[PDB]
Amino acid sequence: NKITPNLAEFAFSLYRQLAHQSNSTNIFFSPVSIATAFAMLSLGTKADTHDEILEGLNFNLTEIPEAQIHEGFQELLRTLNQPDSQLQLTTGNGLFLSEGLKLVDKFLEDVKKLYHSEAFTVNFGDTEEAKKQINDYVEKGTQGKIVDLVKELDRDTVFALVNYIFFKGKWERPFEVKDTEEEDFHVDQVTTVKVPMMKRLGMFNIQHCKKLSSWVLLMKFLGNATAIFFLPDEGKLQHLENELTHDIITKFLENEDRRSASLHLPKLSITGTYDLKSVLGQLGITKVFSNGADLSGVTEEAPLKLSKAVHKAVLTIDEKFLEAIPMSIPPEVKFNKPFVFLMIEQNTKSPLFMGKVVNPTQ
Numbered sequence: 001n002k003i004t005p006n007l008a009e010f011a012f013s014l015y016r017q018l019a020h021q022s023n024s025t026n027i028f029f030s031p032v033s034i035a036t037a038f039a040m041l042s043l044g045t046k047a048d049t050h051d052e053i054l055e056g057l058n059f060n061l062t063e064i065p066e067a068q069i070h071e072g073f074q075e076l077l078r079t080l081n082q083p084d085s086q087l088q089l090t091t092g093n094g095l096f097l098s099e100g101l102k103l104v105d106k107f108l109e110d111v112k113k114l115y116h117s118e119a120f121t122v123n124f125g126d127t128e129e130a131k132k133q134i135n136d137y138v139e140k141g142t143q144g145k146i147v148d149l150v151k152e153l154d155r156d157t158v159f160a161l162v163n164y165i166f167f168k169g170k171w172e173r174p175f176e177v178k179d180t181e182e183e184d185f186h187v188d189q190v191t192t193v194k195v196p197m198m199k200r201l202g203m204f205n206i207q208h209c210k211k212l213s214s215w216v217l218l219m220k221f222l223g224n225a226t227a228i229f230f231l232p233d234e235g236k237l238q239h240l241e242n243e244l245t246h247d248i249i250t251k252f253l254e255n256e257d258r259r260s261a262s263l264h265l266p267k268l269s270i271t272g273t274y275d276l277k278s279v280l281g282q283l284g285i286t287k288v289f290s291n292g293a294d295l296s297g298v299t300e301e302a303p304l305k306l307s308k309a310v311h312k313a314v315l316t317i318d319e320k321f322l323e324a325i326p327m328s329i330p331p332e333v334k335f336n337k338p339f340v341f342l343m344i345e346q347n348t349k350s351p352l353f354m355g356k357v358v359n360p361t362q
Contacts, residue, residue: 002072031352088223097122
C-alpha cells in the first residue's frame with residue numbers, strides 16, 4: 001500500500017479546502033476516484049504540466065518514483081473491480097475529445113488497459129449535443145442515478161473529463177427498519193430539524209476520543225469497506241477537522257475492541273458535485289487546464305487543454321448474526337448534529353470517500 005499515505009493526505013487537503021470555502025453545505029467526494037482520474041490523465045502530459053498534477057495529488061516526486069505511483073493505482077483498481085465483490089460500488093471516468101484531433105494511440109491504450117477508463121470522440125462544435133452525450137454516458141453508467149451532470153460547456157471546449165462514483169452501502173450488521181423513526185437533527189446549537197433516524201442497541205467499535213474531542217464509530221460494509229464517523233463534542237467541529245491525521249485513523253482501524261451503545265444514525269442519501277478545475281486549481285493543478293498545457297501524450301500536433309473537469313459522488317445508506325449485550329447502562333450516541341466521515345477500503349486502507357453531513361435532508 002505504497003500510495004495510501006499520499007491519498008490520505010490528498011483527502012485531507014481537498015476536504016480542508018472545501019470546508020474552508022463553505023460553512024453550511026454537505027461535503028461528499030471520493031479522494032480515490034479523483035486521484036485515479038488525474039493519475040490516468042498524467043500519462044498524457046509531460047514536464048511541468050505532468051509534475052503539477054502528481055504534486056497536486058500529494059506525491060513528492062523527489063521521493064517516490066512514478067512507477068510506484070502507477071503500480072499503486074493499478075493495484076487499487078484491481079481490488080475495487082474484483083468480479084466477486086459484494087461492494088456495490090460503481091465508478092467510471094470518461095474522457096471526451098474533439099473529433100478533429102489526431103490522438104496518440106499509446107494514450108488510448110494506456111487509459112483503457114491500465115486504468116480501465118473510457119475515451120470518446122465528440123463534435124464540440126455542437127455544444128448542446130456534446131453535453132447530452134456526456135450526460136447520457138454518466139446516466140447509463142449509473143443506471144439512472146446521476147442525470148444531467150454537466151450543465152454548461154465553454155464554446156472553445158475540445159477536451160472534457162467526467163469522474164463519477166456511486167456507492168449503495170450494505171451493512172455487515174444491519175439495522176431493523178421497525179426501529180427507524182423521525183428525530184431531531186441539531187443543525188446548530190439552537191436549531192433542530194426532523195430526519196429519519198436508524199436505531200440499534202448492540203456492540204460497536206465505538207469510543208470517545210479526547211484528542212479529537214469526538215465520538216469515533218467504525219462500522220463495516222459488505223465488500224471490505226469500513227465507515228468511520230466522527231461526532232464532535234459541542235463547539236468542537238473545527239477542532240476535529242484540524243486535528244484529523246492519517247495516523248489517528250490507522251489506530252482506530254486496527255482496534256477491534258467493542259462495547260455496548262444505543263446508536264442513533266440517520267439514513268443518508270447525499271451527493272457532492274465539484275468543478276475540479278476550480279477545486280484542483282486551488283491545490284496547485286493549473287497548467288493542464290490552461291492554454292499552455294503540455295498534453296502532447298494525447299495529441300502530438302494540435303494544441304490541447306482540459307476545459308471541463310467534473311466530479312460527482314453519490315451515497316446511499318439505509319438499514320439494509322447475533323450480538324451479546326451486557327446488562328449495564330449503555331451510552332446513547334446520537335449522530336443528530338453535523339459530523340465528519342470517511343469510508344476506507346480494508347485491503348489498501350485507501351480513502352474511498354470523505355465527507356461532512358451538516359443536514360441529511362439537504
